[PDB]
């Protein structure tokens, strides 16, 4: 019913080989609590897993694609909580080569609450200018930053007669008038008939505020999901001591260099991420940053729980395993690298993992690839670490 989005923008995939396997594991069977980003898909890719998606909380990015068409048929409303380049809630860019996307096919797309539309540099995309946008954008937030390119090489979404565009706002905020709490159309005059609640969905009943039930996303849920914190106000949020990367002091720090390693000593729970990069172990000549030493990594031998991701793209060649994390037990996956992964190990050259205490990954996928020395990847009980029917292990380029 409810899934989470992804947070890479125009960046080449971390694994081009398992990109479609990553997507399918995320949007398999309705509401996306984040950004829907579909980039670098091959022309023969099958996207039958996107058929049931209904609403997107953030923005919809479809860029650098080669597919014939993306089947987001039932997509109703993209709320635009987050925006691409802080202006656009829908962004279609460079779909093709200088095949490519053919038609939008967003047949039921009715409301974009906050944000704009950006369509540019599409070699063979059509019907990008015959569809009105002012009838889709919400009245309250009319920041319709529209930048559409009309150049092509080949009042509806597509050529088919089933792609009829139902003008809603132009023909009350919404009508067919709808109830004040109904976002995307309605089939009647009551408050239990519309097909997308504007503010909250209390068991099929659209209301402005949750009955002080628990608010979560845009639905009045009876109890918060597994990996969500419940506050006294009544909200299911992710954040209400040590602080990891991207948390209240290191919001702009990208790696665990030698500058910010002393503050983790003696810690038993990091409220953030843990990113290891090539520049952590070779300090830049610009600043007096001594290269990190394998002996200085022992400050993580007391860690027990990490509230974010554990990303390793560089490791000292003297260390043959991750035994410095033999005490870490749970990765909460509340903050995921690129918005999708909670455990990544790429190009490390380790001979065995050594995460003997890991017993749960609260959210996000797992990438263990390009470790051409690494055995003991299958022997780990991965199904006993996952907690959702959306997590999977993606592994390529490893030791045979």
């Amino acid at each position, epitope marked *: 019913q409810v899934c989470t989005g992804t947070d890479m923008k125009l960046r080449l995939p971390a694994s081009p*080989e398992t*990109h479609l396997d990553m997507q399918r594991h995320l949007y398999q069977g309705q509401v996306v609590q984040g950004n829907l980003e579909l980039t670098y898909l091959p*022309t023969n890719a099958s996207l039958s897993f996107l058929q049931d998606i209904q609403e997107v909380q953030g923005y919809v990015l479809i860029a650098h694609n080669q597919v014939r068409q993306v089947p987001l048929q039932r997509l109703r409303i993209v709320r635009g909580t987050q925006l691409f380049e802080d202006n656009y809630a829908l962004a279609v860019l460079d779909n093709g080569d200088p095949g490519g996307l053919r038609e939008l096919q967003l047949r039921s797309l009715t409301e974009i609450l906050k944000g704009g539309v950006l369509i540019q540099r599409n070699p063979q995309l059509c019907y990008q200018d015959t569809i009105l946008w002012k009838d889709i954008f919400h009245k309250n937030n009319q920041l319709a930053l529209t930048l559409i390119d009309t150049n092509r090489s080949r009042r509806c979404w597509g050529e088919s007669s089933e792609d009829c565009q139902s003008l809603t706002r132009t023909v009350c905020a919404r009508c067919k008038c709808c109830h004040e709490q109904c976002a995307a159309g309605c089939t009647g005059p009551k408050h239990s008939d519309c097909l997308a609640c504007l503010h909250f969905n209390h068991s099929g009943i659209c209301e402005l505020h949750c009955p002080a039930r628990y608010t979560f996303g845009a639905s009045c849920v009876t109890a918060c999901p597994y990996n969500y914190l419940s506050t006294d106000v009544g909200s299911c949020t992710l954040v209400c001591v040590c602080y990891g990367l991207g948390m209240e002091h290191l919001r702009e720090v990208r790696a665990v260099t030698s500058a910010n390693i002393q503050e983790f000593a003696g810690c038993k729970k990091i409220f953030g991420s843990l990113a290891f990069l090539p520049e952590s172990f*070779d300090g830049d000549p610009a600043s007096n940053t001594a290269p990190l030493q394998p002996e200085q990594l022992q400050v993580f031998e007391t860690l027990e729980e990490i509230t974010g991701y554990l990303y390793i793209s*560089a490791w000292p060649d003297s260390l043959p395993d991750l035994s410095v994390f033999q005490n870490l037990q749970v990765i909460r996956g509340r903050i995921l690298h690129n918005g999708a992964y909670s455990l990544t190990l790429q190009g490390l050259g380790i001979s065995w993992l050594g995460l003997r205490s890991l017993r749960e990954l609260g959210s996000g996928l797992a990438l263990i690839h390009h470790n051409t020395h690494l055995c003991f990847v299958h022997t780990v009980p991965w199904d006993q670490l996952f907690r959702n029917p959306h997590q999977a292990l993606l592994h390529t*380029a490893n030791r045979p």
Partner: nanobody, 110 residues
Framework: QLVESGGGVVQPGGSLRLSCVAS????????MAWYRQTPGNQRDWLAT???????AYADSVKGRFTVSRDNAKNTVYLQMNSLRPEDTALYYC???????WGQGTLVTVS
């Protein structure tokens, strides 16, 4: 910043050897992987080579292609053998420890 060199036109049954020279000299020789993008498809993995030197080849090209490196010049080669008309595509080298990508060198077999 990675630049490859060694592609071009070749006869079927021939051989080729690409290179991938790093513009900067890293402190550690890192890990570089070889890909191949047939037009319209995702760039398929070919081979990977680590800092130590242990390689890993895909199933399709294992036994024909050979990957190696020279730490003196920080260049990684991809020695191709018994080339075949189906092998024509764009060949790119990526730096796995950093996610830096090359620009590609088109290899044509005819």
């Amino acid at each position: 910043q990675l630049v490859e060199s060694g592609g071009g036109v070749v006869q079927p049954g021939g051989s080729l050897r690409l290179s991938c020279v790093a513009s900067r000299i890293p402190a550690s020789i890192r890990t570089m992987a070889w890909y191949r993008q047939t037009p319209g498809n995702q760039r398929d993995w070919l081979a990977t080579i680590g800092s130590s030197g242990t390689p890993a080849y895909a199933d399709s090209v294992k036994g024909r292609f050979t990957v190696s490196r020279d730490n003196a010049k920080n260049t990684v080669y991809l020695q191709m053998n018994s080339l075949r008309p189906e092998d024509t595509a764009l060949y790119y080298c990526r730096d796995v420890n950093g996610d830096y990508w090359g620009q590609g060198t088109l290899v044509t077999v005819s």
